[PDB]
Amino acid sequence: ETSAVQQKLAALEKSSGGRLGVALIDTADNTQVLYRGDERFPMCSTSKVMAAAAVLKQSETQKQLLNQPVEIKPADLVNYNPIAEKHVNGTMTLAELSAAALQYSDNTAMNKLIAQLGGPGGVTAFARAIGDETFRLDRTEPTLNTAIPGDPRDTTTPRAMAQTLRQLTLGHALGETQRAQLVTWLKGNTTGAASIRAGLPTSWTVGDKTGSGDYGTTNDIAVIWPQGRAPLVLVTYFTQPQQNAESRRDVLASAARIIAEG
């Protein structure tokens, strides 16, 4: 059975030619609205939130950890390194790496976070520690974005990621200073203007992390503070049938516009 919300999302999906996954949590009353909420989708760069959060968790017991400088070698650079390339043969602190990974989607920065955590499995272990039984990180950048249909590597579900993002930003999966820091990073994202944010009222404050990958995979996860009412968490995942499909951030904006109604 479907609601009119789900019907509108299904029509958007049909028009788009792809596969859309949505999870909304309204923290006013803890209700969820889901569309394909328990299907797996390739996370692509949305997985950077879990890696940054895992380092924040480490820093709760190692208070200067975020200011620890990490060497950037020429050999560390991958396919998209807008911030890390400014620091070759120099350093970036774990905070700088987190900001670059989250706010510019720097892929070298993500690999440094993964290395700090002992490999992709260290990111997954943190997910499990905070009650996310669904997330899995299997690979580093850039291969975590292959996004092959049916492949469970580097996937989660909309429901699981919405629940986790809520716990990380509005709940207490992290300590107070750390939750606030994650919120600061997400709010300052530079890559999200055409995704969820484009579908929401401009008066609403938004923190988000986008993702993109093969199969035209186009994703965004957000914490949203509407005017005059309790915050929301929204995940919008989208992927397409053919490997070289074009990005469709407009689909994410359209999904957010549907969800915001009412």
Residue numbers in the entry: 25 to 57, 59 to 238, 240 to 288
Provide the authors' original text about this structure.
We have utilized class A enzyme CTX-M-14 from Klebsiella pneumoniae as a model system, because it is the most widely distributed extended-spectrum β-lactamase (ESBL) globally. The clinical usefulness of β-lactam-based antibiotics has been significantly shortened by the emergence of specific bacterial enzymes referred to as β-lactamases (BL), able to hydrolyze and functionally inactivate β-lactam antibiotics. In this study we show the crystal structures of the β-lactamase CTX-M-14 with covalently bound Bortezomib and Ixazomib at high resolutions of 1.3 and 1.1 Å, respectively. Ixazomib is well defined in electron density whereas Bortezomib show some disorder which corresponds to weaker inhibition efficiency observed for Ixazomib. Both inhibitors mimic the deacylation transition state of β-lactam hydrolysis, because they replace the deacylating water molecule.
As reference we determined the substrate-free enzyme at atomic resolution (1.0 Å) to identify possible changes upon inhibitor binding. The crystallographic asymmetric unit contains one monomer and the active site of all molecules is solvent accessible and not blocked by crystal packing. The solvent channels are large enough to allow ligand diffusion from the crystal surface to the active sites and therefore making this crystal form perfectly suitable for successful soaking experiments. The structure of the native enzyme can be super-positioned with the Bortezomib and Ixazomib complex with root-mean-square deviations (RMSD) of 0.11 and 0.14 Å, respectively, using all atoms of the polypeptide and without remarkable positional deviations of any residues. No induced-fit mechanism upon inhibitor binding takes place and all active site residues remain in the position as in the substrate-free enzyme. In our crystal structure of the native enzyme at a resolution of 1.0 Å, using phosphate-free crystallization conditions, this site is occupied by a sulphate ion. In the inhibitor-free CTX-M-14 and in the Bortezomib and Ixazomib complexes Lys73Nζ is in the identical position.
